[PDB]
Design an enzyme around this catalytic site. Sequence first.
Site, PDB file in Angstrom:
ATOM      1  N   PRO A 105       0.778  -1.244   0.000  1.00  0.00           N
ATOM      2  CA  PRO A 105       0.000   0.000   0.000  1.00  0.00           C
ATOM      3  C   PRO A 105       0.806   1.290   0.000  1.00  0.00           C
ATOM      4  O   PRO A 105       1.886   1.385   0.587  1.00  0.00           O
ATOM      5  CB  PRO A 105      -0.805  -0.098   1.294  1.00  0.00           C
ATOM      6  CG  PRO A 105       0.067  -0.927   2.194  1.00  0.00           C
ATOM      7  CD  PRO A 105       0.683  -1.950   1.292  1.00  0.00           C
ATOM      8  N   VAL A 106       0.260   2.270  -0.710  1.00  0.00           N
ATOM      9  CA  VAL A 106       0.654   3.668  -0.624  1.00  0.00           C
ATOM     10  C   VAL A 106      -0.474   4.375   0.116  1.00  0.00           C
ATOM     11  O   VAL A 106      -1.634   4.295  -0.290  1.00  0.00           O
ATOM     12  CB  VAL A 106       0.859   4.311  -2.017  1.00  0.00           C
ATOM     13  CG1 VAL A 106       1.000   5.821  -1.893  1.00  0.00           C
ATOM     14  CG2 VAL A 106       2.075   3.706  -2.723  1.00  0.00           C
TER      15      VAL A 106
END
Lengths: 127, 127, 127
Positions: free
Chosen positions: A66-67
């Site tokens: 994830p970002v």
Amino acid sequence: PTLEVFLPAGHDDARKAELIARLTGATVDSIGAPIESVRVLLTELPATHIGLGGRSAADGAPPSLPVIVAILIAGRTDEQKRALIAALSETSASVLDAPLQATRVMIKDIPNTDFGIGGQTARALGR
Amino acid sequence: PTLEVFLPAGHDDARKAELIARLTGATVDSIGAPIESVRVLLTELPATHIGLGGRSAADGAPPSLPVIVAILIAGRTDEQKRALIAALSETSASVLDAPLQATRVMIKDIPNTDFGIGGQTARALGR
Amino acid sequence: PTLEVFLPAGHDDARKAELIARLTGATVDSIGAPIESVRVLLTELPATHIGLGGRSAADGAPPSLPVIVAILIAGRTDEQKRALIAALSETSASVLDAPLQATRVMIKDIPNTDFGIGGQTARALGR
């Protein structure tokens, strides 16, 4: 606080609800936000829409999600942000079974003149 | 660097992969980031989600060039940023057979205190 | 709703407050969200960060802001989205004294399984 979480498409509703629950907890613990003020927005991406090192995830790129974008009203200290970054990263990595090294966090610090709730600025509201 | 590329729907997987590869190369050339550090996130939107001049394409606006948000750790020079806007824009125009004049890049600097890499802040690393 | 407005740096606090109030009203009118649910963040950009045609605003680019990213819980109709694009564009152009043609809106729909409020999904909360 408002989190936008870029994550691979495919996870089920239970995992997404858990991600939302745990990232919310991580935020409350890190920067002392009232739990009801924490908004989480999950943005799913197909593998063809994810690139790392010029290669798409569909073409074998290593994990890159994830970002997480964390939108905060200005005021948190550098070390509070450091704690937020650690907590969101380890939590999202754990829940999604992603490598911690792959996680990225970007805090957007918004001046209180530049943030609105219900049409009123954070500065107007004493925040 | 992380590029969020707001893209109208309709391009096939090969063009998406070409865009990821070529925007990544443009980023490496213009600001010298390690290629493995460059992330591209394609945010593909239906025409009904995209407004230009107050209307969607469906209501008469001309077709949308991509809008690229380039998220950088603070510290790149003005020259680097100038080069980045040119390179990402030329690349967008070339890859998508589209008017260079309408290409859009918005650079967002994130303070090194506000940026997370594998759970650590950029500032805590050598950045 | 969560609106992120990219705008030139330098507007005074009164104008920013007016922009927040008026964009909030535009959102309530257009899609009927509870006013207290509408969050606005202004992301100010230096002129060197604002790219159109491969050139920055500081380097002679024509007007290209405001650009608004509107993140909504899924379910709004195409007509609601059309109204939102028009109202957000006209309102932000008027407040910031910008040409309408410069404005852009990008709507992201978030499924109610992917949206969190206080650690609970919108679906959990009956939204």
